[PDB]
Structure 1
């Protein structure tokens, strides 16, 4: 019935994940899985409560483009379990191993990313932290959006969010901006502001609105509709940003227009 994996069917193996928000591993549980150790041992009822409530959200999701939640566990220590992805992150591909994708594939990856997000917003879930780092290309064709449940990745933050004008800057639109940047990534092979060695400047500039991503780097064969759709997603006034309903349409229209 309940999604709490009982004690010790999970074989934490191979380390993977970075900082402290959580630490990620490869595991075994009816086949390969990934496990995110929340590493906040001895909760603390109720942070156990807030957490289990966080779970409530993940279990709200059943969809191909969203990293599949398989379960959570408390007992060894708080943790989350998802399907393992045989492949590499949109980030990794693009910016570390430098994968030359077909333009077609690029458009497709965007489309699937688009698909997923739209589904999330359908179930009223703001991701709050999309980035090329969280888009895993499973088996090199299926796009899996993860790390939405529950610092140094500010290139995807809409100014509205950078500059902290109130308590809640995070909208669907904040999410559309992020997506707009991963569009940019796909379309230019690279990061924004790739030519600025200082972070706080980037924060300050995009915040105050002096520094905008260079769109002249969208190489030649990125179709105008897609480039214009990038333009759209990045508009700094969020109201002028199109949501995924419409975002999906614009792509799927130029999707027909070019499998030849």
Structure 2
């Protein structure tokens, strides 16, 4: 069972915080990460967000999904997961401008798809796939998670970005996001960098007037990869491949 015995978790340095939790590097049978509700005596809504994350996490045992280790309630609500050295894909691509070789870029995309495939098989829609939620453990293994606490607009499918009433999230919207991550990998940059207006991007992606510029993908990038990416970014929801297909396609070209 996953309730950690009372008073075992030690909190160390603070990493990040926000309305929906505070994160520390901690100690529990070695290095762990700890997500704590800091101000205690919680809302029935905070208690629900806790129960919801624990419900999803306790379903996941996979190398490409951050390792949930257990939870606690005393003295306060907490989620314990493995500690990872390294940094997010976003940080590597867009802040320190790491230049991976092509065979490694494909490896990163494969692992992300392994992970996505797994979540979908357990009926989990990520809802927020972006390169910042793809961690590079020792810059080697990929760990998917939700590392945050409308900074995900760039990865939003037109159905999502359009702010429709009826829930717009599906397996296919996650795929769209994956397609943008692929663009990020293959072009080394973020889409729509020549537009400085957020409302304008929202409006244009949403109406289908604006789409990522696929001619920016490097020449050493396999033609079957560029194809897969375009297939992933299709404006029609159901034309987009599902994750078993994507994985199969990536593992196919991964041979050449």
**Structure-1-length-normalised TM-score:** 0.92
CA distance in 2 between partners of 1:128 and 1:46 (Å): 20
Secondary structure of residue in 2 paired with 1:71 = strand
CA deviations over 1:10-54 (Å, ceiling 9, x no partner): 222222225433332211111111112244631245753563243
Contact 1:173–1:241, Cα closer than 8 Å, also in 2: yes
For structure 1, which segment, 60-69 or 145-154, has the greater mean C-alpha deviation from structure 2 after superposition? 145-154
CA distance in 2 between partners of 1:40 and 1:168 (Å): 31
Secondary structure of residue in 2 paired with 1:14 = strand
CA distance in 2 between partners of 1:219 and 1:21 (Å): 39
Corresponding residue number in structure 1 for 2:254 = 255
Secondary structure of residue in 2 paired with 1:133 = helix
Go from structure 1 to structure 2 and tell me whether the alpha carbon gap of 1:13 and 1:76 turns closer, same or farther (over 3 Å shift): same
* Alpha-carbon offset, residue 150 of structure 1: 11
Aligned residues: 256
* Alpha-carbon offset, residue 132 of structure 1: 0.4
Structure 2 residue runs without a partner (length 5+): none
Go from structure 1 to structure 2 and tell me whether the alpha carbon gap of 1:149 and 1:173 turns closer, same or farther (over 3 Å shift): farther
Go from structure 1 to structure 2 and tell me whether the alpha carbon gap of 1:127 and 1:148 turns closer, same or farther (over 3 Å shift): farther
For structure 1, which segment, 154-163 or 28-37, has the greater mean C-alpha deviation from structure 2 after superposition? 28-37
CA distance in 1 between partners of 2:47 and 2:21 (Å): 15
Structure 1 residue runs without a partner (length 5+): none
Corresponding residue number in structure 2 for 1:37 = 36
Contact 2:16–2:23, Cα closer than 8 Å, also in 1: yes
Secondary structure of residue in 2 paired with 1:12 = strand
CA deviations over 1:74-130 (Å, ceiling 9, x no partner): 223222111111111111111111100010000000000010000110111000111
CA deviations over 1:133-184 (Å, ceiling 9, x no partner): 0111111211110118992221011110011233211000010001110011
CA distance in 1 between partners of 2:211 and 2:193 (Å): 12
Contact 1:54–1:149, Cα closer than 8 Å, also in 2: no
Q: CA RMSD in A?
A: 1.9
Contact 1:130–1:148, Cα closer than 8 Å, also in 2: no
**Structure-2-length-normalised TM-score:** 0.94
Contact 2:156–2:177, Cα closer than 8 Å, also in 1: yes
Contact 1:129–1:148, Cα closer than 8 Å, also in 2: no
CA distance in 1 between partners of 2:20 and 2:193 (Å): 26
For structure 1, which segment, 21-30 or 103-112, has the greater mean C-alpha deviation from structure 2 after superposition? 21-30
